[PDB]
């Protein structure tokens, strides 16, 4: 049980107490996924309008 790194100031204090020692995707890669999803939406909508046309 030891106390280390004690820092004091007007607003408060902080310290550490030890009890026992130890025993990304790019922008283009994003827009490809977003644009892929937009295309799957547009494809499904085109199939709908084709069906309604029939």
């Amino acid at each position: 049980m030891e106390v280390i790194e004690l820092n004091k100031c007007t607003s408060g204090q902080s310290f550490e107490v030890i009890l026992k020692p130890p025993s990304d995707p790019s922008l283009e890669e994003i827009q490809k996924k977003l644009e892929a999803a937009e295309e799957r939406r547009k494809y499904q909508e085109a199939e709908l309008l084709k069906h309604l046309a029939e």
């Binding site: 909508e45 709908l48 309008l49 309604l52």
Partner: protein, 425 residues
């Protein structure tokens, strides 16, 4: 935000008119379109169903459609007839003869463009349109045949908006003509493809409630439409009044419909009214889930609930509401699917309907609804196996194949409901 309302045919226009009477009363709008309410919650979400014309007038965002003028003339002469926008009356003269083909293929096709013109004109004045609600019956010609044709055209022109219907299912106990099972069967297939939410209002159930519960020896259509208007006011309460849930049609569809085709709801209401005794929350919850209070003639104990949405109106104990809801779920544990966690949702609204201190409205996506579609299918097959009455339809250009396909599709729908009535976790 905004909802565009459409009522088509005799049944569609009569229940639609009652709906506008009831909700205009709840929002404090008089028959001249003037606000005379005492609470601000009456006007907070008023624009969901009403446009505001200068002069502080509110006009229902409603479109009235029929192929014969009689019912719409009565609506113009009835109470609140002067509230509707006169340009929004769209009607023909020939009628549809209780014939689905006439509403869908021949007479209706002539009028559809004028209806879509009024629809477009209402949509253009919408800040952000949620979608459409249609009132109609499936047993006639105009609401059924032209109703579904309208839905198809609207989906073509507004594919991303929600399509919601209040659909009155025919019953031999309240039958206008023998061909009602044909019309309904043809309509159901359309609904299965082109609506997101359909409230199944079964005339058999409405009749039973008027006869048995309400003790009315001889019910009229007006008596049924009292139940229908009370229900329609209940299910739209979360759309019209401010609340913690901030509900809209798309959220309701997302949370109520686990599988796109199985979107046919069983509504319920309590207390059944046609009395000054105060109703407690346990009584409201028990009546609400009782078959006798549901407006589709199905036994919920013959299937399982996929999802449930319940709204309680009036000033009452929310803790007691939650207690009773959890309790009723535990008593009826066998009738709720377990593979959908938290599939019963409860909402509260402080404002009660007219003439009640508290009420409860129930929206159930249950597999028991298959009974309804089985009923119709049987009636259909009984006539179709002998081709009875088919000439009325072949005379309008249809072919037997289209009937065989509609029958096959509805039996498929029944099969799909059975699949999930069996499935467990």
């Amino acid at each position: 935000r905004e909802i565009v309302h459409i009522q088509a045919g005799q049944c569609g226009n009569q229940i639609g008119a009652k709906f506008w009477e009831v909700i205009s009363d709840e929002h404090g709008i008089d028959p001249t379109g003037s606000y005379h309410g005492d609470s601000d919650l009456q006007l907070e979400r008023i624009n969901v169903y009403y446009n505001e014309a200068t002069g502080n007038k509110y006009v229902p965002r409603a479109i009235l459609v029929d192929l014969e003028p009689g019912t719409m003339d009565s609506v113009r002469s009835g109470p609140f007839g002067q509230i509707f926008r006169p340009d929004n009356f769209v009607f023909g003269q020939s009628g549809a003869g209780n014939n689905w083909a006439k509403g869908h293929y021949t007479e209706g096709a002539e009028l559809v463009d004028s209806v879509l013109d009024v629809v477009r004109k209402e949509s253009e004045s919408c800040d952000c349109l949620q979608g459409f609600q249609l009132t109609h019956s499936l047993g006639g010609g105009t609401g059924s045949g032209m109703g579904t044709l309208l839905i198809s055209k609207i989906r073509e022109e507004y594919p991303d908006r929600i399509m919601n219907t209040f659909s009155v299912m025919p019953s031999p106990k309240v039958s206008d003509t023998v061909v009602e099972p044909y019309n309904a069967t043809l309509s159901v297939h359309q609904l299965v493809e082109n609506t997101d939410e359909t409230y199944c209002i079964d005339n058999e159930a409405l009749y039973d409630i008027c006869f048995r519960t309400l003790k009315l020896t001889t019910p009229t259509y007006g008596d049924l439409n009292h139940l229908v208007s009370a229900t329609m006011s209940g299910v739209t309460t979360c759309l019209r009044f401010p609340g913690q849930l901030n509900a809209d049609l798309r959220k309701l569809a997302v949370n109520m419909v686990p599988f796109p085709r199985l979107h046919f709801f069983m509504p319920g209401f309590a207390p059944l009214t046609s009395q000054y005794r105060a109703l407690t929350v346990p009584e409201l919850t028990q009546q609400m889930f009782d078959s006798k209070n549901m407006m589709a003639a199905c036994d919920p104990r013959h299937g399982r609930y996929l999802t449930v949405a319940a709204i309680f109106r009036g000033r009452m104990s929310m803790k007691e509401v939650d207690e009773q809801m959890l309790n009723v779920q535990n008593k009826n544990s066998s009738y709720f699917v377990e593979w959908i966690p938290n599939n019963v949702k409860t909402a509260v609204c402080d404002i009660p309907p007219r003439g009640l201190k508290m009420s409860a409205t129930f929206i159930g996506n249950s597999t028991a609804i298959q009974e309804l579609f089985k009923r119709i299918s049987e009636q259909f097959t009984a006539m179709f196996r002998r081709k009875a009455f088919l000439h009325w339809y072949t005379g309008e250009g249809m072919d037997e194949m289209e009937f065989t396909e509609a029958e096959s599709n509805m039996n498929d729908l029944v099969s799909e409901y059975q699949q999930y009535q069996d499935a467990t976790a």
